Amino acid sequence: GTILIDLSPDDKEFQSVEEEMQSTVREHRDGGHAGGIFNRYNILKIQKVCNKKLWERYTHRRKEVSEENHNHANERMLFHGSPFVNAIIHKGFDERHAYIGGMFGAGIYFAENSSKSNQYVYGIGGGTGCPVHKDRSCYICHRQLLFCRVTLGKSFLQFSAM
Amino acid sequence: AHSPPGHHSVTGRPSVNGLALAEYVIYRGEQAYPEYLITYQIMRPE
Ligand SMILES: C[C@@H]1CN(c2cc(F)c3c(c2)N(C)C(=O)C32CCN(c3nc4c(c(=O)[nH]3)CCCN4C)CC2)C[C@H](C)O1
Ligand SMILES: [Zn+2]
């Protein structure tokens, strides 16, 4: 029951989301090994993901979390790159498919830096790169990221040496 | 896995790279909604 609605580049909502993508690119200490060498994107399409049951599932949990955290859902908009983006948009996120080997425990990972999530669009560490050219720095092939509404609630602050 | 006792998520905050923004972990699929699907290319630096 997922519907994808194309946003017009003339629309302030498109421009706003593009700006979040572009403005959160950073240099990565792998020199581009995982996600490629770039300072900016060419945004080709931005689609709103509409799914009533997944949304109600999210807002139901958001309410529980809010009530457990002095009425503060601590809701953020965060990036997520994954080979399984097409499954995520139809089936939702699924903690039975958490990232087992993530630094911060087996869970579902999100990034403020769009370019961090870009490192995972082709797999862990970029996998073997784009399917057509096997190039983690492919400038030709289209990539897809999700920009997700994420409820953090009371978030455990873990400082990492990254 | 489970979130820390009494917590709903983890904030992973870089303490070495000052330009690196945070990463976040949740432990229930219901705590995220995939709101926008962004199709893009990385661009070759000029
Ligand atoms: C059976 C296996 C499945 N397999 C595979 C590949 C894969 F790429 C993943 C998974 C699985 N699973 C469960 C995932 O979760 C991820 C996807 C998303 N992902 C992620 N991690 C991020 C950020 C982010 O946007 N996405 C930003 C913040 C920092 N961070 C760590 C983590 C890796 C392919 C392999 C050949 O066969
Ligand atoms: Zn390619």
Domain limits of chain B? 1-46
Does the domain formed by B1-46 have CATH 3.30.420.40? no
User: Could you tell me the two tokens for A88?
Assistant: 């995520």
Amino acid at A109: Y
Query: A97-109: string of b/e by CB count within 10 Å (b at 16+)?
Result: ebbeebebbebbb
Taking chain B, what is the end-to-end CA distance rounded to the nearest angstrom?
A: 43
Structural domain tally of chain A? 1
DSSP letters for A1-47: --EEEEPPTTSHHHHHHHHHHHHT----TTTTTTT-S-S-EEEEEEE
Contact between B10 and A156 under an 8 Å Cβ cutoff? The reply is yes
Mutation target vs A (from B15, B26, B27, B46; most A CBs, 10 A cutoff):
B26
Instruction: Note the resolution in Å, 1 decimal.
Output: 1.9
Give the residue among B23, B39, B26, B5 at the shortest CA–CA distance from A93.
B26
Question: What ranges make up the beta strands (E) of chain A?
Answer: 3-6, 41-50, 75-80, 108-111, 143-151, 155-160
- Experimental method reported for this structure: X-ray
Q: Cα B20 from chain centroid? A: 12
User: Which CATH number do you get for residue A4?
Assistant: 3.90.228.10
Q: What range does the domain containing A117 cover? A: 1-162
- Tell me if chain B has a CB within 8 Å of the CB of A86: no
Neighbours of A118 (CB within 10 A): 25
Residue whose tokens read 């990232």: A99
Amino acid at A144: Q
Cβ–Cβ below 8 Å for B39 and A78: no
Of A78, A141, A154, the CB nearest to B7: A154
Chain B residues whose CB is inside 8 A of the A94 CB are: 29
